[PDB]
Design a protein around this nucleic acid. Structure first.
Ligand SMILES: [Mg+2]
Ligand SMILES: [Mg+2]
Ligand SMILES: [Mg+2]
Ligand SMILES: [Mg+2]
Ligand SMILES: [Mg+2]
Ligand SMILES: [Mg+2]
Ligand SMILES: [Mg+2]
Ligand SMILES: [Mg+2]
Ligand SMILES: [Mg+2]
Ligand SMILES: [Mg+2]
Ligand SMILES: [Mg+2]
Ligand SMILES: [Mg+2]
Ligand SMILES: [Mg+2]
Ligand SMILES: [Mg+2]
Ligand SMILES: [Mg+2]
Ligand SMILES: [Mg+2]
Ligand SMILES: [Mg+2]
Ligand SMILES: [Mg+2]
Ligand SMILES: [Mg+2]
Ligand SMILES: [Mg+2]
Ligand SMILES: [Mg+2]
Ligand SMILES: [Mg+2]
Ligand SMILES: [Mg+2]
Ligand SMILES: [Mg+2]
Ligand SMILES: [Mg+2]
Ligand SMILES: [Mg+2]
Ligand SMILES: [Mg+2]
Ligand SMILES: [Mg+2]
Ligand SMILES: [Mg+2]
Ligand SMILES: [Mg+2]
Ligand SMILES: [Mg+2]
Ligand SMILES: [Mg+2]
Ligand SMILES: [Mg+2]
Ligand SMILES: [Mg+2]
Ligand SMILES: [Mg+2]
Ligand SMILES: [Mg+2]
Ligand SMILES: [Mg+2]
Ligand SMILES: [Mg+2]
Ligand SMILES: [Mg+2]
Ligand SMILES: [Mg+2]
Ligand SMILES: [Mg+2]
Ligand SMILES: [Mg+2]
Ligand SMILES: [Mg+2]
Ligand SMILES: [Mg+2]
Ligand SMILES: [Mg+2]
Ligand SMILES: [Mg+2]
Ligand SMILES: [Mg+2]
Ligand SMILES: [Mg+2]
Ligand SMILES: [Mg+2]
Ligand SMILES: [Mg+2]
Ligand SMILES: [Mg+2]
Ligand SMILES: [Mg+2]
Ligand SMILES: [Mg+2]
Ligand SMILES: [Mg+2]
Ligand SMILES: [Mg+2]
Ligand SMILES: [Mg+2]
Lengths: 47, 274
RNA sequence: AACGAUAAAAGAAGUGAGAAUCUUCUUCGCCGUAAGGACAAGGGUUCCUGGGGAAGGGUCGUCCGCCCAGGGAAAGUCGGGACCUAAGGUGAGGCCGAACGGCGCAGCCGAUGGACAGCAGGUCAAGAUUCCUGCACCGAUCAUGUGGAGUGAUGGAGGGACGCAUUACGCUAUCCAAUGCCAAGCUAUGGCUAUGCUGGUUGGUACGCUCAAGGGCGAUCGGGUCAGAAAAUCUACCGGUCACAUGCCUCAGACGUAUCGGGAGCUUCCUCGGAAGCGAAGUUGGAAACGCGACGGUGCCAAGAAAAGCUUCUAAACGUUGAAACAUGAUUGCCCGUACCGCAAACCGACACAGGUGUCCGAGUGUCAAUGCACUAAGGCGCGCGAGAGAACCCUCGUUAAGGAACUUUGCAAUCUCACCCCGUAACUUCGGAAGAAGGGGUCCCCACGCUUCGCGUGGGGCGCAGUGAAUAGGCCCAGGCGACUGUUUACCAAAAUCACAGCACUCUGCCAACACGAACAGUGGACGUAUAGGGUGUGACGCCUGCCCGGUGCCGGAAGGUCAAGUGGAGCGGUGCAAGCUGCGAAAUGAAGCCCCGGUGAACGGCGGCCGUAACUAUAACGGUCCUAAGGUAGCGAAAUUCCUUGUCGGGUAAGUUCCGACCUGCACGAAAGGCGUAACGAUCUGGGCGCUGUCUCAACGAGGGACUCGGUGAAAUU
RNA sequence: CCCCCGUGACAGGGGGCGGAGGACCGAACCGGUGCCUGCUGAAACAGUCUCGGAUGAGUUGUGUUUAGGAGUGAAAAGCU
RNA sequence: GAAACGAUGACUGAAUCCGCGCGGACCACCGCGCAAGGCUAAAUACUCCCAGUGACCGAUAGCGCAUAGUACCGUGAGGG
């Protein structure tokens, strides 16, 4: 049957993207929080 | 008056349709058709607000002018009577010797090819746009505005009449289709006559579908819902309320007045609607 | 245990340390509106070449979608951008808000849409509307000529500009036929010796007085300021005028000619088999699109985007011996996308998983038609364990004496029925229907005759058990309950009598409407709607109807009075100081809405009921009916989806009937929009009965296939 | 719509023609009725057979909006 | 609470030297005080980073890491 994850480049970028995350204080707060954890993958646009 | 249908499908007996044989078969004016997108009854925060709206045929808007003061003095002729989807009334096209084309609500009787004149100096015949005071008493009229030049806000849906009870102060006593009596500034324009279509009240929808074609999503009985959903929800069967008839939000329906208690307009209402 | 669909394999040959698994050959089998082909989304080197073999592969591998290396992807014309706007997202100014922030006109972003110049071929081991060949096209800049006075925006107008169903005429893609044309060779096994057999049979471009259906069509003058902010040869009005049949215009496509390709194959060389060279024919007849002519015709109501490019007109402007416009020539041509998988082993499903994934293409024969069914072409594949056995038992199937629902909770299951033609067809009804009701017949081959052909009718003849000869392919009826109906629902135990529904009623709402989302005097929905509209509530086609009770409660209305908070008013009481004074508490009268109270209100919430007497041991099946709260059941219905007593009582059907039907009325505990009683029709609803048919059964057999068993290979699990 | 037949106060009725429909049989597609299989599955919901819808209240792609006492819901406390 | 005092949201709003504000209702007296105008280092907090030390740990310990926020899981936040 049709499963949850149904890949869509533009979806992913527009939703979990760097521009997206920067558009809001809470997403900015993710960015900083992640940087802090030392993630290789700051954000989806890093893939 | 209305088109009927032999019962060749079950939902085709009761069904009826309007009489279009008097509508000049024309596409609306390219210079007068606007784009009307729909709304689910959703507002700029995205929430359903107006409840049970959706679907239905695609609609273009046809710009109308109600305040005819733009073209007062000069007169036009009736070019045609076309169909408008967003109004109960049929509408009609105007060709001025002036050269401009306009759209005005189309009153009961008024035939194609007639001429019509807006502005204070105009006869009490069908279609003329007169200030209220210049209207002979007891006349039958519609398209009444509530402020001079603001535009017709009263008597617009099919087959509706306003009957001037008669002059007074600066103002004129007016009879509203609800049966309510109102005071209206005599400087306000109006247009002579009953509204038209008029047989509109008699058409029969017939099949669920028709509701949907008119963009009306099905309407949900509270009693079917659940406690969590709505006051009338719950119980172990078909149930009768178990409390006063009440809206989703809890305020009493059936009998509870709602018009705001302290309001400016009140000293212009001479008799309540009844 | 299992090795992931029961579509299927066999031999030879090669390779190799090793082969059931790799390679080649010959066959066999399976898909063929697909299991073939082409896009999109997604994936990311998985493509090609050469090598490799630890692990990955449910066995094995010498192989691979795995591992290593190197190659491979080419665009002015296809798609995106340098153009356009939709929903939506944004958004200086501007409107709101403890903060972060929420809105928000123009403008702007935003394809899933508008716009827009290139076709036919060839070929890498791997690219192709990109490269190569052949001939076109587009804008831009310049030069030479035709120049010889206009160019026309950031504003105007035209235009772009749009629905559903149905349908006439012409054509193409494309497929069929043939003693048309062309090419090849053969004679099989009894015959054929070609009139047999196999294969092929025109794509682009240009021109052409050839053919051509269909499709597009007003012109001009003048007037009116007031319309387009203004302007205006443009647009819209009004008026005048112009030979209706049409011509004016276009040419899908056809024919012809010429030319550029392609073309069955032929040849030659040769290196687990490719390289180059060459090249025949082009018919007549028929079918035919959802494609093209096309923005066609007709009918319908629910009434079917925007903006730019485009055409037209002025404003301003610079010009008016270089203005547009044209012709030829040269020049120029950005950015990203193109490999490969792409109904799947390469995407989503932890897997090389029986699932899921949007669009286009999708041949032939047979069949009323078809994207159905059978077989098949092209193409693709035999599903990455195998071999034997031929027990129980299990799954999926074939048939089954006599009987035929005796099975069972229930005909659950399985059978019977099955397409097309003709004949024929009930109660009942809203006159549409029920209806394919029911039921009966026909169906194949040859020949002649007739007719409108692919075909059919008629007659006669023929063969078999049987002629929709195989596959696709309704079992029917009688009678209840519920819901009118098509629809909808619990992803993953309920599809229904649930919900929705058209119709009906009550009520609110006069527009900054009620109502609703909101930090909010923002903004928004309602609605660019206006009481024939909008919200909320209940009922649920249709028909006949929809009774009694306003005491309690809730709503609408009333008002003498009793009322009631802050406050207004402080009579009066105390504190302190020697005192002017400062100061603690504080009574009347007055004082809003609201409650008390009066009336109204049921398609408002609701109510329409307690009960009187029996022979004997502190007691069971049965009883006829008077009637307290505001009232105490009008119709219709009743042992009911409602009945405790209960298998009520009678009748029906049955050999026998706790179920079903009808009637009865003693309704524990029906009843009128929480609708009452009916109702044709509709139902994967529920219930009872019948006909037919059957392994459901008496009662099980025989058969088949897939497991289970045996051998070689890989080898889990819950539990303990 | 075109011809034809009927006049008790009567719609009607026949023929041509037209091509309507929450019409019908049925594939794609959408759906899940019933039985069996499956139940350490081929699969964390399926398979074969059977069945419902199949011009509509239809199915579907893309872009986008709505959310946690909140959304959304032809209403199952379903779905998020 | 007998509720002083500061503090503002609403309404209202005086004296400037014999004047003003306090001293826990309130008055007298006795005491302390110069509101409505601004800046100010030092002692104090913390520890990403650096150095020294340790009756701290030595590979299941010690940071999650003898290094990695990687592999891996999740649409994501996030986990690891
Ligand atoms: Mg309703
Ligand atoms: Mg419910
Ligand atoms: Mg509640
Ligand atoms: Mg309730
Ligand atoms: Mg085994
Ligand atoms: Mg296998
Ligand atoms: Mg096998
Ligand atoms: Mg050898
Ligand atoms: Mg094999
Ligand atoms: Mg060989
Ligand atoms: Mg395929
Ligand atoms: Mg790529
Ligand atoms: Mg292996
Ligand atoms: Mg080797
Ligand atoms: Mg490969
Ligand atoms: Mg080129
Ligand atoms: Mg915004
Ligand atoms: Mg696009
Ligand atoms: Mg193009
Ligand atoms: Mg383009
Ligand atoms: Mg045709
Ligand atoms: Mg052809
Ligand atoms: Mg022949
Ligand atoms: Mg012979
Ligand atoms: Mg623009
Ligand atoms: Mg490719
Ligand atoms: Mg899985
Ligand atoms: Mg496999
Ligand atoms: Mg698969
Ligand atoms: Mg086809
Ligand atoms: Mg076929
Ligand atoms: Mg088939
Ligand atoms: Mg083949
Ligand atoms: Mg393949
Ligand atoms: Mg038998
Ligand atoms: Mg027998
Ligand atoms: Mg029986
Ligand atoms: Mg059955
Ligand atoms: Mg009949
Ligand atoms: Mg029959
Ligand atoms: Mg015989
Ligand atoms: Mg026979
Ligand atoms: Mg069958
Ligand atoms: Mg139903
Ligand atoms: Mg149904
Ligand atoms: Mg379920
Ligand atoms: Mg079910
Ligand atoms: Mg009062
Ligand atoms: Mg009996
Ligand atoms: Mg009975
Ligand atoms: Mg009912
Ligand atoms: Mg073994
Ligand atoms: Mg239908
Ligand atoms: Mg469903
Ligand atoms: Mg104070
Ligand atoms: Mg150790």
């Amino acid at each position: 049957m049709k499963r949850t994850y149904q890949p869509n480049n533009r979806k992913r970028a527009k939703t979990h993207g760097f521009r997206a995350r920067m558009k809001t204080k809470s997403g900015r707060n993710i960015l900083a929080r992640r940087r802090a954890k030392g993630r290789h993958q700051l954000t989806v646009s890093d893939e | 008056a209305v088109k009927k249908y032999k019962p060749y499908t079950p939902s085709r007996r009761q069904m009826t349709t309007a009489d279009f044989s008097g509508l000049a078969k024309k596409r609306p004016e390219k210079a007068l058709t606007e784009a009307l997108p729909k709304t689910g009854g959703r507002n700029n925060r995205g929430r359903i607000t107006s409840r049970f709206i959706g679907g239905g045929h695609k609609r273009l808007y046809r710009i109308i002018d109600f305040k005819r003061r733009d073209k007062s003095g000069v007169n036009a002729k009736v070019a045609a009577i076309e169909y408008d989807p967003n109004r109960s009334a049929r509408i009609a096209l105007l060709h001025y010797a002036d050269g401009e084309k306009r759209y005005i609500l189309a009153p009961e009787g008024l035939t194609v090819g007639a001429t019509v004149n807006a502005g204070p100096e105009a006869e009490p015949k069908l279609g003329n746009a007169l200030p209220l005071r210049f209207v002979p008493v007891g006349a039958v009229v519609h398209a009444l505005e509530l402020v001079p030049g603001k535009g017709a806000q009263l008597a617009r849906s099919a087959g509706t009449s306003v009957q001037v009870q008669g002059k007074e102060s600066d103002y004129v006593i007016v009879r509203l289709p609800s049966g309510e009596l109102r005071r209206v500034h005599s400087e306000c324009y109006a247009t002579i006559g009953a509204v038209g279509n008029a047989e509109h009240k008699n058409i029969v929808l017939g099949k669920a579908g028709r509701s949907r074609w008119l963009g009306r999503k099905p309407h949900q009985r509270g009693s079917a819902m659940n406690p969590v959903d709505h006051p009338h929800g719950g119980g172990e069967g078909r149930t009768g309320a178990g409390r006063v008839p009440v809206t989703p939000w809890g305020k009493p329906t059936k009998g509870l007045k709602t018009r705001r208690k302290r309001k400016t307009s009140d000293r212009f209402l001479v008799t309540r609607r009844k």
